[PDB]
Design an enzyme around this catalytic site. Structure first.
Site: not given
Lengths: 49, 251, 98, 427, 33, 432
Positions: F135, F138, F244, F246
């Site tokens: 889009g 985004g 977060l 790993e």
């Protein structure tokens, strides 16, 4: 806090589960057996009579 | 691949022995009475004993009158307990305030330098407040000491108030009037039953308070904090935190 | 609209607290940690030391004081050797007092 | 007659020492409220070995309890034993290392070392006479292998006189749990050789055997498996804590086991194991305990001990016993198979005695072995290592926080020359 | 048949059986009520 | 105190975060009007003096109909008045408008509220971006933010759940340009790019859950459960929890490999769950069948590189070792030489809470694999192929040149894709 609370709580859980379930199941089974048997007995005998 | 408890498949036999021994040990514990259920129910039944207060032949309080300690509902911060908190022995013992209004045996205080077991009580005069645990049959006592660097309350760190067995002068309280221009005229008048009167110590001259702002999670679930610190406003009168009422039973 | 369709609130979808608390002991097994390594017959006080039994104690009391009888099947003079004495209370000598 | 300082780290070690600091609490009759409610005056004798005192008669351990994550420290003092551990003996960060050795050994696990170094000398100088330093951890992550094996290089800077003993967890052969194991396994083996003396190797493939084939359960888990390791620990030092016939200690064990400056890698065991069905059908005597402690199926490492030789064998015993039946069955098992011992040493098996087994056992033993089939545990790492280094995979976790390739290519030249020593003496 | 019944309970059982019908009726009314 | 400040970019980002933050307010005691044991709701839910929890994430859309529909929906009293950011004009399927003008006009209030959240936190691990390749809002606003945040906050974890356009079927005409350009500008500033599709979830919502004719609102909760069993390790307790770092250190081998594939195993409805037997083995053998991938690619044309099994619920930790051991004895599941370990397992015990009256049932064992594969280079081959057919005619390029950016980005955004596929071909071979 959480530790003590939940520890005591689950100890309760296990014990209760065990005792309650066992007792209730046993009672139910034996009582049902007795009732059915005796009822059948009396009714059949009286019908025959 | 994996089945339930009772069907005769796989490794059932060693597990049958395992729950056989665990089930028998649990039944032995229940038969002896060492289980948390029956110990806890016996303790809580001996705490929450439905017992009876003493009505008053007039408005006034006498000694020996079995009298509840309660703090009225107030209309400062947005943490709040709703209304009419009471002073209850919360063991682990400890002391706190709980949302109740009935006499239930951890509520019930007996009013104990005066002499006669029935004697009219007056403002500014020392007395003691008694409470008893189940089957102990020995008088506990409401106490609080001058603040030290090791003896502070639980959540707030002010002067703390607790219960003790011994007898001293750190057990005597005296109750005065909240309207500050009339207490020197009220220094000897008898105290009516359900009226809002300040409670203060005699050695510290601090006063017993209820903190409706920090909570004490207990077994009973009902929450507050008690301490002793006198509060005053910018107009320098006493806040609604410190008002206390010593209510008796209805006839 | 479909947002106002689906996002009607739900008063009373209380999450459970129980399956997490039971998976905790599904992994852990709290009273289980002596049922793993205990052996033979349950027994609370079983334990005593060798100086105190052989020297100060003067040995087993209810056993055979003199007789050592030679048995039939197994070829052995057991009734002295077979006891391995365990009489009475454990080694107490007065330190818990002090 | 000493005290013991015992270190714990990693997500592992506080789920192993949680079982270790409660068998010691069981054997000394320690209730979890701090006091002592045992039965004899024998247990109260050498209470000092594991339990300092304070007012009121309560005993608090010598525990060191360190981890980067606060994940498991919420779980060890929320157990049954929560008021027995020390309050200011929990040292932590906020972040978690998680499978790398750079930020355990050099940066993120490292700034808390000065918060472990200055808690040891608060207590390990207040102990009157220490025997040495113990440690339990896993090599497989970033807080045991990152901080503890860093601190193993740090505390041996101060005291060379004492004795380093280790309870290590090497990674399992067949089914592993992390893709970056043969770095953290590789680099900490090269750490361990210079600064550790009796290094004990423990696996979970070798323990998921024992709770299945031997003790015959159907759900073996970690708590079922942590306790057999925590049975070994108090079955090691049985004579510094209780009387007996022939007392041994962690300096008696090293003289009779390790010959050499470099041949100091071990292998453990624990003797009296059976099911829960055949509890009364067995006889716990010496011809049964000795028959299984030498067997391969009763071993806590990835060793087939028949494929090599034991250079040396240790032992210990407990319980009111006699000595002739432990004099000849370790004399028969040296005699019946000379194939599984090396010829140039004249004796192999050391015997030690105590008076008391762990509470519930009747008689006990704890097998400790310096076999040279422990080099079949360090061949699969070096097979896994250089078949990863050749494609240079994952190396930017290993240049990114302070290490080089020269900390790598010399961390296998220690593992090669170790196996290059153990193969000289195999036959 | 092994059932001890009050007189008012028997009258109520007969009334409920007659209301259920435009032994089976008596056993069904005794089981339901 | 281990918060996850999340970003939702675009129409896609807000329309998936509706169901994602639905599940986060569902699993706790969190009412949909702020009000309300465990205190692990402070990792997504702040406090005040009234017990009122307000979520700590940012929602951006320049096309304000979805945001005003949120503001007037049932979820008005809960979200903050400021971390919902609107414009009055959309980027409207172009990279230029979103990356140079409409991104530049309003990137500053986004960065302001990110700095306010990041300095009201104490324990942030990293950044989690939910955005759309195909889009305008985004992609341009996305790459503008992922330059303007990686220039400030530096080295930190960056995971991107990305609503990738479909392989065959499509929605907008000129998605190859706006896919290729944002991929070239994301590869140098990514850490892990988890990838999902739409028709690949339509296929599974037809063939597994047996509901026919579903919507975006029936597709959105499957991603809304995927993200929750991804983040579950901070959310509750467990045996082997996962931070977060790993994922980002276990899943990507190289500088330019980072494109894993997501899949979520136990997908079944209420009338069928009570008669099927939820075994660990059957779950993990469903999760490897190529009829059960969220990305329409066939893994048999290439080799895996690294996996991540992340469990949830009543794990029996012996059975996970048994399941991986029976996975490893197959030839239909292939691996490269250099990863001999090739697995990771994370654990949590809390069972998956499922929305009332949904298309899914109360599963007791949730499995998410976030594995990478060299059979995503086949997926990149098609959006280079479409670009090759389109650029030769020089079609559509005036929309791109007329808002500031030159035409010379179009050659480098293909040279970058050629070198990336060169990387993916040279990594997956054997060395001898």
């Amino acid at each position: 806090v959480e530790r003590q609370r939940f520890l005591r709580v689950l100890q309760n859980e296990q014990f209760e589960l065990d005792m309650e379930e066992a007792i209730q199941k046993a009672e139910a089974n034996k009582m049902l057996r007795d009732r059915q048997l005796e009822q059948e007995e009396r009714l059949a005998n009286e019908l025959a009579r | 691949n994996v089945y339930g408890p009772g069907v005769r498949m796989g490794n059932w036999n060693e597990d049958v022995y395992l729950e056989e021994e665990r089930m028998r040990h649990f039944l032995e514990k229940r038969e002896k009475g060492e289980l948390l259920i029956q110990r806890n129910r016996r303790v809580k039944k001996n705490i929450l004993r439905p017992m009876q207060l003493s009505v008053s032949e007039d408005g006034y309080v006498h000694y020996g009158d079995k009298v509840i300690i309660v703090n009225p509902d107030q209309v400062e911060a947005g943490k709040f307990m709703r209304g009419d908190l009471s002073l209850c022995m919360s063991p682990d013992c400890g002391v706190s305030a709980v949302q109740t209004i009935a006499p239930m045996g951890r509520n019930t205080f007996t009013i104990l330098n005066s002499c006669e077991m029935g004697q009219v009580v007056v403002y500014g005069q020392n007395f003691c407040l008694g409470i008893a645990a189940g089957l102990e049959g020995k008088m506990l006592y409401l106490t609080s000491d001058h603040r030290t660097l090791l003896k502070s309350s639980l959540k707030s760190g002010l002067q703390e108030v607790t219960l003790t067995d011994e007898v001293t002068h750190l057990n005597c309280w005296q109750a005065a009037f909240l309207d500050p221009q009339l207490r020197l005229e009220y220094e000897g008048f008898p105290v009516r039953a359900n009226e809002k009167i300040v409670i203060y110590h005699r050695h510290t001259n601090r006063a017993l308070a209820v903190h409706r702002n920090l909570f004490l999670r207990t077994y009973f679930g009902k929450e507050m904090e008690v301490v002793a610190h006198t509060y005053l406003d910018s107009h320098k009168v006493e806040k609604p935190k410190n008002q206390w009422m010593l209510v008796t039973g209805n006839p | 609209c479909i947002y106002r369709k689906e996002y009607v609130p739900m008063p009373d979808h209380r999450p459970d607290f129980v399956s997490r608390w039971y998976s905790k002991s599904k992994m852990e097994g709290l009273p289980y940690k002596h049922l793993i390594t205990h052996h033979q017959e349950p027994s609370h006080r079983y334990l005593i030391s060798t100086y105190d039994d052989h020297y100060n104690r003067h040995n087993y009391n209810p056993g055979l004081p003199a007789l050592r009888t030679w048995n039939g099947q197994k070829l052995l003079w057991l009734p002295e050797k077979s006891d391995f004495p365990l009489v009475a209370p454990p080694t107490n000598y007065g330190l818990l007092e002090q | 007659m000493r005290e013991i300082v015992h270190l714990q780290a990693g997500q592992c070690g506080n789920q192993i020492g949680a079982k270790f600091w409660e068998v010691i609490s069981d054997e000394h009759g320690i209730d979890p409220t701090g006091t002592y409610h045992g039965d004899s005056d024998l247990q109260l004798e050498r209470i000092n070995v594991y339990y300092n005192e304070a007012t009121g008669g309560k005993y608090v351990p010598r525990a060191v309890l360190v981890d980067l994550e606060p994940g498991t420290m919420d779980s060890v003092r929320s157990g049954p034993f929560g008021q027995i551990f020390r309050p200011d003996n929990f040292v932590f960060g906020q972040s978690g290392a998680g499978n790398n050795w750079a930020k355990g050994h050099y940066t993120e696990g490292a700034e808390l070392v000065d918060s472990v170094l200055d808690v040891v000398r608060k207590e390990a100088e207040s102990c009157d006479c220490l025997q040495g330093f113990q440690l339990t951890h896993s090599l497989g992550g970033g807080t045991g292998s990152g901080m503890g094996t860093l601190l193993i290089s740090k505390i041996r800077e101060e005291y060379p006189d004492r004795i380093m003993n280790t309870f290590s967890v090497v990674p399992s052969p067949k089914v592993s749990d992390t893709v970056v194991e043969p770095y953290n396994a590789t680099l900490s083996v090269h750490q361990l050789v210079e600064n550790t003396d009796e290094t004990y190797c423990i696996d979970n493939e070798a323990l998921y055997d024992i709770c299945f084939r031997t003790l015959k359960l159907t759900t073996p888990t970690y708590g079922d498996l942590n306790h057999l390791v925590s049975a070994t620990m108090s079955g090691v030092t049985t004579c510094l804590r209780f009387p007996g016939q022939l007392n041994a200690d962690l300096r008696k064990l090293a003289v009779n086991m390790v010959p050499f400056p470099r041949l100091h890698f071990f292998m453990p065991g624990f003797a009296p194991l059976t099911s829960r069905g055949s509890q009364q059908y067995r006889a716990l005597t010496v011809p049964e305990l000795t028959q299984q402690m030498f067997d391969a199926k009763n071993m806590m490492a990835a060793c087939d001990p028949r494929h090599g030789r034991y250079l040396t064998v240790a032992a210990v015993f407990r319980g009111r016993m006699s000595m002739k039946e432990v004099d000849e069955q370790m004399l028969n098992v040296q005699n019946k198979n000379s194939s599984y011992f090396v010829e140039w040493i004249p004796n192999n098996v050391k015997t030690a005695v105590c008076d008391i087994p762990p509470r519930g056992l009747k008689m006990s033993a704890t097998f400790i072995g310096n076999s040279t089939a422990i080099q079949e545990l360090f061949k699969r790492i070096s097979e896994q290592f250089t078949a990863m280094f050749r494609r240079k995979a994952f190396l930017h976790w290993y240049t990114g926080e302070g290490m080089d390739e020269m900390e790598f290519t010399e961390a296998e030249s220690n593992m090669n020359d170790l196996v290059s020593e153990y193969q000289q003496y195999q036959d | 048949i092994g059932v001890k019944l009050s007189k008012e309970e028997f009258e109520n059982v007969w009334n409920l059986a007659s209301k259920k019908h435009q032994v089976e009726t008596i056993r069904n009314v005794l089981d339901e009520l | 105190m281990r918060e996850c400040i999340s970003i939702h970019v675009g129409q896609a980002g807000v329309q998936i975060g509706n169901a994602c933050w639905e599940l986060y307010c569902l699993e706790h005691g969190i009412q949909p009007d702020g009000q309300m044991g465990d205190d692990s709701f402070n990792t997504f839910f702040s406090e005040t003096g009234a017990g009122k929890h307000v979520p700590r994430a940012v929602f951006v859309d320049l096309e304000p109909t979805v945001i005003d529909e949120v503001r007037t929906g049932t979820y008005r009293q809960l979200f903050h008045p400021e971390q919902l950011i609107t414009g009055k004009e959309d980027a409207a399927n172009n990279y230029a408008r979103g990356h140079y003008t409409i991104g530049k006009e309003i990137i500053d209030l986004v960065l302001d509220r990110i700095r306010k959240l990041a300095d009201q936190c104490t324990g942030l691990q990293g950044f989690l971006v939910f955005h759309s390749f195909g889009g305008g809002t985004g992609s341009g606003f996305t790459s503008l933010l992922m330059e303007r945040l990686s220039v400030d906050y530096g080295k930190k974890s960056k995971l991107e759940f990305s609503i990738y356009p479909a392989p065959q079927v499509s929605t907008a005409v000129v998605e190859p340009y706006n896919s290729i350009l944002t991929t070239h500008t994301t590869l140098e500033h990514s850490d892990c790019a988890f990838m999902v599709d739409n028709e690949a979830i339509y296929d599974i919502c037809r063939r597994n859950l047996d509901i026919e004719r579903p919507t975006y609102t029936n597709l959105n909760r499957l991603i809304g459960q995927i993200v929750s069993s991804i983040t579950a390790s901070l959310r509750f307790d467990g045996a082997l929890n996962v931070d977060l770092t790993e994922f980002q250190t276990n899943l990507v081998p190289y500088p330019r490999i980072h494109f894993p594939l997501a899949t979520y195993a136990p997908v079944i409805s209420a009338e069928k769950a009570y008669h099927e037997q939820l075994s660990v083995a059957e779950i993990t053998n469903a999760c490897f069948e190529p009829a059960n991938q969220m990305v329409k690619c066939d893994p048999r044309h290439g080799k895996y590189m690294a996996c991540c099994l992340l469990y949830r619920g009543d794990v029996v930790p012996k059975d996970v070792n048994a399941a991986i051991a029976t996975i490893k004895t197959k030839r239909t599941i292939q691996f490269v030489d250099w990863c001999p370990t090739g697995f990771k397992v994370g654990i949590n015990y809390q069972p998956p809470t499922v929305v009332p009256g949904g298309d899914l049932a109360k599963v007791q064992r949730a499995v998410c694999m976030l594995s990478n594969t060299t059979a995503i280079a086949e997926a990149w081959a098609r959006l280079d192929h479409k670009f090759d057919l389109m650029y030769a005619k020089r079609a559509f390029v005036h929309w791109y040149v007329g808002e500031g950016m030159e035409e010379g980005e179009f050659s480098e955004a293909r040279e970058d894709m050629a070198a990336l596929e060169k990387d993916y071909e040279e990594v997956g071979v054997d060395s001898v």
